[PDB]
Amino acid sequence: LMQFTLPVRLCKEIELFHFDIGPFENMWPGIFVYMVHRSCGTSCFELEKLCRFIMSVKKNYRRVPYHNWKHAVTVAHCMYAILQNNHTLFTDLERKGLLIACLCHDLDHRGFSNSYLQKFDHPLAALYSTSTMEQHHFSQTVSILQLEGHNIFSTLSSSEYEQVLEIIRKAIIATDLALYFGNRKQLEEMYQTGSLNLNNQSHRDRVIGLMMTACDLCSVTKLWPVTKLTANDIYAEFWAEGDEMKKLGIQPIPMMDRDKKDEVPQGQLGFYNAVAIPCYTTLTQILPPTEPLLKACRDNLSQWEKVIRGEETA
Numbered sequence: 001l002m003q004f005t006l007p008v009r010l011c012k013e014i015e016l017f018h019f020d021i022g023p024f025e026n027m028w029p030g031i032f033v034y035m036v037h038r039s040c041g042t043s044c045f046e047l048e049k050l051c052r053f054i055m056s057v058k059k060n061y062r063r064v065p066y067h068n069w070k071h072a073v074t075v076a077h078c079m080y081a082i083l084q085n086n087h088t089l090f091t092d093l094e095r096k097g098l099l100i101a102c103l104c105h106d107l108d109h110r111g112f113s114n115s116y117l118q119k120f121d122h123p124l125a126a127l128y129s130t131s132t133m134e135q136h137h138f139s140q141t142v143s144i145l146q147l148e149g150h151n152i153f154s155t156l157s158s159s160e161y162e163q164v165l166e167i168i169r170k171a172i173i174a175t176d177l178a179l180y181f182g183n184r185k186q187l188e189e190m191y192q193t194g195s196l197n198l199n200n201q202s203h204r205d206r207v208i209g210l211m212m213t214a215c216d217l218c219s220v221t222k223l224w225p226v227t228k229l230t231a232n233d234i235y236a237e238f239w240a241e242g243d244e245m246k247k248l249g250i251q252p253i254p255m256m257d258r259d260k261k262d263e264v265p266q267g268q269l270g271f272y273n274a275v276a277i278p279c280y281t282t283l284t285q286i287l288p289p290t291e292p293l294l295k296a297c298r299d300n301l302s303q304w305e306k307v308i309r310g311e312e313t314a
């Protein structure tokens with residue numbers, strides 16, 4: 001066989017939840033294949049088809065500040081770390097599906113929210129009334145899988161192929177943060193009443209949904225310099241959308257108003273308290289080996305509090 005190998009530092013550090021994939025774009029496909037070979041197996045996919053698939057996915061990500069090819073591989077890496085630290089809990093089809101779902105979960109993102117597409121009256125908002133961009137990301141995934149020489153699932157039966165496409169569809173739709181609030185609430189109740197059952201497919205769907213949120217938000221689980229620099233790319237997109245809201249004659253929400261830049265630290269504190277800490281708290285309850293995501297999130301919360309007290313500059 002031809003096995004994928006990484007340099008010594010990457011080989012060691014890729015196993016850590018807080019790994020950063022680095023600024024060499026040309027290394028990310030190899031990093032992805034490495035993660036697929038270790039989390040799924042060297043026989044899960046034909047290397048030639050997988051490579052052609054990866055390069056077509058890359059081509060259908062846009063040159064936007066945050067929702068770009070680097071984000072796709074970053075979200076895939078967080079999923080790799082979750083799978084490797086919980087390897088007994090997931091099925092053959094789930095391992096095959098979930099790294100692909102993460103790579104594809106923001107395909108053809110233009111850096112605008114579902115709310116902006118609705119206010120703009122974008123054609124996608126007529127096609128998909130809810131989870132507008134996420135239904136688009138899945139449609140883009142299906143289109144690429146149906147290109148000649150791109151069927152990475154060609155050895156699966158019709159029924160197995162249908163199952164893995166349903167895992168991918170639900171996983172991509174789950175990255176609509178609007179759906180996360182309800183999903184986490186249901187999982188919290190199920191855990192605290194002890195009704196959560198990983199043999200129940202509807203329960204597995206919710207757990208995978210929370211894993212997708214955890215992977216999607218994973219900039220808050222990196223080391224502080226990575227977290228802080230990623231926030232700049234996030235606000236670059238938010239503020240561009242705010243500008244476009246102002247052009248439609250609509251007051252943007254505060255996080256999208258570039259004139260509110262000085263309030264970003266308090267905005268981060270609000271986001272960690274309302275979204276991130278609860279997300280990683282619930283995930284650690286269900287999958288205890290994901291504890292390092294919650295620890296890193298709490299560490300970054302303390303950094304933002306330090307910025308607010310003027311002991312740090314942002």
Ligand SMILES: C[C@@H]1CCCN1C(=O)c1cnn(C)c1C(=O)Nc1ccn2cc(-c3ccccc3)nc2c1
Pocket residue numbers: 177216217219220231234254255256260261263264266267268270271
């Ligand atoms: C769901 C979208 C899509 C792209 C990532 N998304 C995230 O939410 C996300 C993913 N990771 N991180 C780190 C964030 C994030 O910074 N969120 C937020 C959330 C709420 N805020 C309120 C303010 C703010 C308020 C007043 C004045 C200035 C700023 N600033 C924020 C940032």
Ligand SMILES: [Mg+2]
Pocket residue numbers: 105106133175176
């Ligand atoms: Mg998305």
Ligand SMILES: [Zn+2]
Pocket residue numbers: 071075105106175216
């Ligand atoms: Zn995303």
